[PDB]
UniProtKB/Swiss-Prot annotation:
GO terms for molecular function: copper ion binding; oxidoreductase activity. Monomer. This is Laccase. Highly thermostable. Optimum temperature is 45 degrees Celsius for SGZ oxidation. Optimum temperature is 75 degrees Celsius with ABTS as substrate. It is found in: Spore coat. Cu cation 1 binds at H101, H414. Cu cation 3 binds at H151, H416, H483. Changing D112A: 5-fold decrease in catalytic efficiency with ABTS as substrate. 785-fold decrease in catalytic efficiency with 2,6-DMP as substrate. Binds 4 copper ions per subunit. The 4 copper centers adopt structures classified as type 1, type 2 and type 3. It comes from Bacillus subtilis (strain 168).
Amino acid sequence: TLEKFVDALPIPDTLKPVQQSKEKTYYEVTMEECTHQLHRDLPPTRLWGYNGLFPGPTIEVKRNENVYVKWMNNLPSTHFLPIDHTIHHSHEEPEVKTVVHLHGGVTPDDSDGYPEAWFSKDFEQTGPYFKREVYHYPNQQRGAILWYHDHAMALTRLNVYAGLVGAYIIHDPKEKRLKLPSDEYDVPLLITDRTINEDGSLFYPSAPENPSPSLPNPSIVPAFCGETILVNGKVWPYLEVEPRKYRFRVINASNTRTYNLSLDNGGDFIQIGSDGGLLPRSVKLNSFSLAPAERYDIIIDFTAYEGESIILANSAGCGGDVNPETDANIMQFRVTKPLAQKDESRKPKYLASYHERIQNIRTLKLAGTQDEYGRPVLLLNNKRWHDPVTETPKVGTTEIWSIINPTRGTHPIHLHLVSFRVLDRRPFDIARYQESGELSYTGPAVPPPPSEKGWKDTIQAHAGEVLRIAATFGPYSGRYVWHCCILEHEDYDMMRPMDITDP
Ligand SMILES: [Cu+2]
Ligand SMILES: [Cu+2]
Ligand SMILES: [Cu+2]
């Protein structure tokens, strides 16, 4: 095992445009086999990286900036992580397929990275919903932390684990007057748990434990928990900071793992933002939950802690209780950087402003059948991906989605295109719902905590609760998706199409 806090936190560079005008910013990003050392004491690791980087370069845009990214694939024809060929059914398609989803993007459908819009190297082969090489991101939306990652059908868990993640920030100039910490004092933190072999190579399980020899090989697993935690591509790093306010864009880019984060001296975060942008009012927190694909925009105020080492800790376990010596640790702040200037940043209470009729109320169930080989298959509302679309909201209208979770565990559910408000959660009789299909509540409705009073696009639906959210669908119409963000679930098969229609 590996010494904690011996490597500096990398901060990914900001991508430079290939061409740029008042009217159009044009970027190129090529997926490439690359080599990077993840820890002082590990041989370098072979990974897949956007422009040869892990994590991918940070992309920074203004609200309404007219952006194009040509996402290209220049990867090997053959994968280096275990492909389970039995999970989706078929001329022969390439083994390695990729497509980039801008998670949180208010995006035209053919630029949203639909799982069947995939492509292989140089776009030689393309999936049946592919339309275009150069994706278009108009960024007509709230300033926020987005992130980009692969979304290829049956492969998402693999392609992401391989290293295909990156941050995308939307800056709204109108927010500049809040004087939030910025520039060097505004730092994204992409958290990814990994398991790494002694020779430096990524370990990803090629079967669950106790593989009955009937079971395919490789076989998909229903969950992955990495032995090590990385932030921005380094195992358990440290970051030297100035004793002053910092903003952090915290992103869970892990396959399965949920984090429950705190500072080991009992100190407080200030949440200024959720997936969908600034909260209306800032919230003071001692801890916070962070499931796959969630994003918390926070301030940590180091002013009074000059000289100190503060650990960003985690108490959520993955497949067992946290281990204090390993996954209980995320990174270490060292407040030893001299101030480069006066800290003019603020941490205001007042951040943003907070009339619509309900067109429809979709009731949706989270549940799993079981396959030929005994393995669990997780399904949204009893459907497989390939079944005729059923979630078909009307452009311009508002729906309430009530998501019922009678499973053993939490699912972070994500809708593309939209961000949405959270209404409440409410517990119910699980046995009763499974026996009869009948829903009896065992307690009142609970509103969201303040963290979740703003806009969200990825939301934890806890076991034995009904969660209700509300979304207005637009401004674009077309074919999108919704799904669980635990990638091991997403790929088998907790993802469905979502058509937003127009007369
Ligand atoms: Cu998304
Ligand atoms: Cu799930
Ligand atoms: Cu998605």
